[PDB]
Design a binder for this molecule. Sequence first.
Ligand SMILES: CCCCC/C=C/C/C=C/C/C=C/C/C=C/CCCC(=O)O[C@H](COC(=O)CCCCCCCCCCCCCCCCC)COP(=O)(O)O[C@H]1[C@H](O)[C@H](O)[C@@H](O)[C@H](O)[C@H]1O
Ligand SMILES: CCCCCCCCCCCCCCCCCC(=O)O[C@@H](COC(=O)CCCCCCCCCCCCCCC)COP(=O)(O)OCC[N+](C)(C)C
Lengths: 488, 30, 88, 100, 138, 324, 92, 40
Amino acid sequence: MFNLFLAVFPEIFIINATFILLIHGVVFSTSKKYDYPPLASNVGWLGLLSVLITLLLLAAGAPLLTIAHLFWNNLFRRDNFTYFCQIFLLLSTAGTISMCFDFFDQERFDAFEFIVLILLSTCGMLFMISAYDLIAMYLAIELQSLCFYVIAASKRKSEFSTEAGLKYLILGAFSSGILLFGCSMIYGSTGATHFDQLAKILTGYEITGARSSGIFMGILFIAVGFLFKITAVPFHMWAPDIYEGSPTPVTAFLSIAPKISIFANILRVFIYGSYGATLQQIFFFCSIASMILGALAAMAQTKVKRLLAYSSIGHVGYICIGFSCGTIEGIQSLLIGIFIYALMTMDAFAIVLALRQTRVKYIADLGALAKTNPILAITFSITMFSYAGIPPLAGFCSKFYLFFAALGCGAYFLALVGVVTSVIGCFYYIRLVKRMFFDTPRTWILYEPMDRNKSLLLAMTSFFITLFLLYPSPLFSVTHQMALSLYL
Amino acid sequence: PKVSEDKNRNYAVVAGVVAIVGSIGWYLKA
Amino acid sequence: MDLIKYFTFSMIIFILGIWGILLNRRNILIMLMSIELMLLAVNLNFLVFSVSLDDMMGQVFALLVLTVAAAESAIGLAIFVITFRVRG
Amino acid sequence: MNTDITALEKAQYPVVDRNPAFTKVVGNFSTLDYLRFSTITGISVTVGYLSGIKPGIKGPSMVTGGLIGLMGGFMYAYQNSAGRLMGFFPNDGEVASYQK
Amino acid sequence: MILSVLSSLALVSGLMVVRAKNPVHSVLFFILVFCDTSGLLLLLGLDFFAMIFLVVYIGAIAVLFLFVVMMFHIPLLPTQRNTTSLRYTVYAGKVRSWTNLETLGNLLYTYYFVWFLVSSLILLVAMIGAIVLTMHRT
Amino acid sequence: YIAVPAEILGIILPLLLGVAFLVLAERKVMAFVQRRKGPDVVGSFGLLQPLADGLKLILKEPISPSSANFFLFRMAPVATFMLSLVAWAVVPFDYGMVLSDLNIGLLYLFAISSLGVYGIIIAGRSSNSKYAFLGALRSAAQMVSYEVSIGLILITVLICVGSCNLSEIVMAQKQIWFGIPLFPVLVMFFISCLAETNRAPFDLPEAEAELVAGYNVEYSSMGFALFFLGEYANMILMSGLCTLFFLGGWLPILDLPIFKKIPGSIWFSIKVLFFLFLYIWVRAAFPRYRYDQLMGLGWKVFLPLSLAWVVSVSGLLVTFQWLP
Amino acid sequence: MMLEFAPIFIYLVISLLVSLILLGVPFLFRFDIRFYLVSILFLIFDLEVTFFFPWAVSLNKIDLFGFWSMMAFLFILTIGFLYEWKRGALDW
Amino acid sequence: PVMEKLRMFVAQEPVVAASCLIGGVGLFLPAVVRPILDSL
Ligand SMILES: CCCCC/C=C/C/C=C/C/C=C/C/C=C/CCCC(=O)O[C@H](COC(=O)CCCCCCCCCCCCCCCCC)COP(=O)(O)O[C@H]1[C@H](O)[C@H](O)[C@@H](O)[C@H](O)[C@H]1O
Ligand SMILES: CCCCCCCCCCCCCCCCCC(=O)O[C@@H](COC(=O)CCCCCCCCCCCCCCC)COP(=O)(O)OCC[N+](C)(C)C
């Protein structure tokens, strides 16, 4: 009876710790004895400890978590792919929550509900990766969606935060409605909400032999909703505004934690529920458009957060290249690109949060940064080059293997567009470089020193980026095992 | 000048000592 | 033929909600009603499909969708009243 | 309810009490399980104390961290003990205990 | 013919929702849309959902919207000559026939109980979010 | 199938005259509690007094400019009155003395009660006043708040019987009423029905709405009286709900097979009028309750306690396998 | 089994007619947040009632599992309501 | 000891203490009494 729950401890524990943190915060934030203490950093440290403990629980249950798989079959199906995806998403969440501690006390934002909502959205993401049915898929999407709608509008003094939160709300609600309408007809035309039986009724007959106007258009609507979820061009109506308006730690959690889970979800849907080979076309054109428009639009931006938003869109296109070529190498390149992009995004947002102590807004404020803090300047330049794809760094390997996967399937146009978009993409990255090493403005902005957690995370990520090409075997082997575990 | 007199901080110190001892035993026994 | 009528009515409600949310970029109130209309149309799709196939996975998920609809409406009006406090 | 606890990937190691009761696996805790439980609880208590000095809540933070650490360490020890009895873990001790 | 007029009136109300002149009348037609929808579900044979639509949509969501608005201002061909007499009724299964409520509750809380707890977590997210944003308490 | 309208009129007209005589009973009982007689001159014992009141109200000039869109103000009384009547289409008087035989008929009652909030809201809004609308809104918030306690108590009742059908609920009370074990739950349900109709010490919202304004709004002569009629019909309905659920709906109270001459149709009416007498007694025995503490009470002493009662009933029934 | 709603429809039509004939007799002769908060709490604690309704009726069929799942649901909403209580937003 | 604080809490909040007591009874009956009567 109780031992049938050995496969859900990494989630039951995080829920219980979330409840304990919420209770402790609400009890001791209104105590007159301590005079309404600012227990946001306390709740944040306890939440980081809880995330570490549930990561330890998840890591040591590799032989476990596959028991009572018949009992849990209707609800979720977790396997080697799900195990690694969860163990990486939880690490990303831990890093994000760790690098935002100074944000709580530097600008006096002691709202512990931020941390509990991070934790609960992370629980929703952990549900999403294990989700193996349309209903659980949609519910796990909605958990993180509502958590982020609440969190984005948390800072209720700036017109950017509120308007960005409202735009995110409306766009996410429309995307969720589109996706749910898509799932409704796939249920209607076949029954069989479960993924296991959805991958068996559609494999029997190809879409070319006979045309089913329900399943095809439901699959199309599901794909459209998912592309809205990851903000893939042309479904990028407000994403730069969302990333600019939202608070910096929120945007740090976004574009890493949500995208990983949504991409795992899209992998599960694409591999099983798609046998008509009609999602190759929708991913093809949309990824090409994302590549081109991200490369051509990030060069015209003068702020920092908008540039990171458009770089995220471009990297989403680069990763989506892997969906068009459906092979083991394509999925391997996709997952490796996701991993490298997650590390580089964490490093870049650590940079942005570091200069947030003095309210950095534009790209010209970080002028002559090689004089005040040379080592931070070097770190930022290295991270920017890693974004660019320069060979002697991580990020070049991901683009390399994505191009290899694209050429493996004979999508020769994908390789050419990838090359040209990379060529333009590196240009404005180097443009960012010039204003930060070479030309010195008349007025210099002075940045106060950083704290230990952000510095440690930044140093670890910087040494990972530079020295990745020396020893990349473990990542490649993890990714090859994960790609094959979708079937066996 | 013989007792710490802070019965709350003492528990933290003994808990930290227990944590260090447990970590060492974990490293050795396993 | 009543399944066809049901599906067409729900689809027209769906496209009408899309129509409502697309036109007025500023009302911010008609958008929430249009989103509710979209959710309503999808709920009717699920329930009608469940009745036709004599399968229960349609009504369970339709009932669960109401929690999402209510939560989205609550958060939407919270953000709306926060936004309105700035102006006027 | 109909419950069937059958892992997709079978245990590579000898299995004893394929469906162990809660009381027995709690009673199967070895010295390593107690050590890891203790170190997890101690780390959690220390973090709770250290973090909650700036807000001023030094004791309540200790209690909250202690509760979190107790729950996490107990879950970890139970998982290890179960996986030992289920046969997923090296379990070289109670396989010998079973024979006698 | 009951389905046609009800669907048409619901469609008209839904159309007037999005092209309304003032938010009050928009919400008023928004209520009528769900009234007609619940009637349609009642015709479909699902009495439980038809009344949950009153309890939730025009019981709490419509009241919430109105509160906010108050302040802050292949088909088978119709030939049926020889089909109304070709209905084969299997009497087995009519004995001990459950309703729309017993059947739903049989498997909502027992087999698919994870999704139920996920919906609970969604409700908790909504409850927390409505408080963090809007507590001025000045 | 043409027999239905006769039943509809037979349910409607006695309800209206019963509302009139319930107003008369209110006046008479409050008079007797205060050592008075009340209306005695008209008729024999005041029995013709409501008729004189009605003929007087009709024979007066109607103040109906409505100072507004001319539509929403005339639809609010219609909506509240039709709702307070349609809530009566499911009550199982004795055995076949029920108009509609809904297989749920209880979630239906909850839905109908919850829908009876828009009437007062649009009455307040349509009545262009800066305080009448606000008072109507506070009253709506009060009813909305006590609806959840009503629903939890309904769930408590529904757990024991096991089926939503109202007739089966009374059928399940052959052994005992459900009022003997659930007496705290019965008190809670009485207080919630008392506070959800603004007919109690839980009254202040509307009481101050007239004190500070004097109802200097578009006050129709007897078009406004439909609110009063609907409120008293709701009084009668929520008086009968308590004797449907917690008391025996029509079963004899404490009876040996001797007093079998009388039918079950009056066993229901006697309990209904007893609960109405209790309503009048509570009104003329307690002082009014402030809205500041009204909301706090309704949210902090009834929701947690009713939830605890739900939990306890469910746990006790499950433990000993006493479920239906 | 569901023909018993046409009587409700006819009753509603006749009640509307009676309301009309009752209203026609003489003719023939600024913002508060607390309101939003109470509405939100009502919505949240009304969804739980809509979830309770299938649980109570079918509670016999499900023993010691559906009951405990509903208890977990209640515990989650009780944690939510406890956070609601201490933070304020519940008194005036 | 905890008894003084618990009793002071019960004195100040009667409804909350009563609700907790009845809920604890209703949760203790099926979690403790039920297994021991299951085994007769
Ligand atoms: C030739 C040389 C050869 C080599 C000689 C070898 C010698 C071996 C020496 C080992 C030293 C161990 C070092 C481990 C150090 C750990 C970190 C120190 C932790 C510590 O702040 O102290 C206690 C707390 O307590 C624990 O939070 C948790 C307690 C953790 C620390 C307890 C360690 C006690 C171990 C006792 C072992 C006895 C060993 C005896 C050695 C002597 C034998 C002769 C005092 O807190 P507190 O509130 O007054 O103040 C703190 C403190 O100021 C800062 O952390 C913050 O700024 C402030 O906010 C506040 O948090
Ligand atoms: C059991 C099921 C779970 C129950 C909890 C679930 C809900 C979560 C609630 C978590 C928050 C609860 C936090 C309050 C608990 C009581 C707080 C407390 O005990 O502290 C007391 C007293 O506490 C103590 O003194 C010692 C308590 C800590 C020592 C024990 C550490 C915990 C060890 C492990 C935890 C227990 C074992 C695991 C559970 C069985 C107050 O002391 P101070 O006021 O800080 O001292 C004076 C401060 N000043 C100088 C400024 C005036």
